């Protein structure tokens, strides 16, 4: 548990973050947002290794209905690729990816800053 | 609120203008006083 903003803005933030990080597989943020999204996305890959209907029906509860992709003149909506490409990598492995890098500070806000993967 | 001085060129081109001033003795006197000092501007 932790608070960044008000309630709605919080979860929609998170949905945009895990919906992010997956087109480009690494971002840069404040440190805290990286921690709560750490929790979330780890729950996602642990979910994503089953492959059920119901797993899709549960994963869609945070991902965005639409996020177009183009990598090799192709198309993926962050969910096709999740349940075809992502869990495939970490089949052998337990949930518990998503290191954190204390990248550096920031100038305008004095903010701490990171990247996560 | 309604602040005062809701402006309008017509009333200002009028009463505080020229032809009034130069259509009354008083206004003529006024323009004189505004001359003996030396003022770049009249009717304002």
């Amino acid at each position: 548990r932790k608070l960044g903003r008000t309630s709605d803005q919080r979860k929609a933030m998170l949905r945009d973050l895990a919906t992010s990080l997956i087109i480009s597989e690494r971002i840069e943020t404040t440190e805290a947002r990286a921690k709560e999204v750490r929790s979330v996305v780890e729950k996602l890959i642990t979910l994503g290794k089953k492959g059920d209907l119901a797993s899709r029906r549960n994963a869609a509860k945070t991902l965005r209905n639409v996020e177009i992709l183009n990598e090799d003149e192709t198309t993926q909506t962050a969910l096709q690729k999740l349940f075809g490409e992502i869990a495939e990598r970490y089949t052998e492995r337990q949930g518990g990816y998503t290191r954190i890098l204390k990248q550096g500070p920031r100038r305008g806000d004095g903010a701490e800053s990171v990247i996560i993967e | 609120v309604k602040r005062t001085y809701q402006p309008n060129k017509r009333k200002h081109s009028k009463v505080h203008g020229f032809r009034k001033r130069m259509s009354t003795k008083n206004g003529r006197k006024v323009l004189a006083r505004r001359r003996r000092k030396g003022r770049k501007v009249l009717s304002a």
């Binding site: 890098l101 204390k102 990248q103 550096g104 | -």
Partner: protein
């Protein structure tokens, strides 16, 4: 509410003994010959 009096030069300075900032802790890189913070990254 307000002060009554001119804060002097002295207690103005005594009030500020703890206005400092602790310098960062640093560490030379592992074979890049320059300092940066602890448990942070070099950039």
């Amino acid at each position: 509410a307000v002060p009554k009096r001119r804060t002097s030069k002295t207690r103005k300075n005594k009030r500020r003994t703890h206005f400092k900032i602790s310098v960062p802790g640093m560490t030379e890189c592992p074979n890049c010959g320059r300092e940066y913070k602890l448990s942070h990254r070099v950039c």
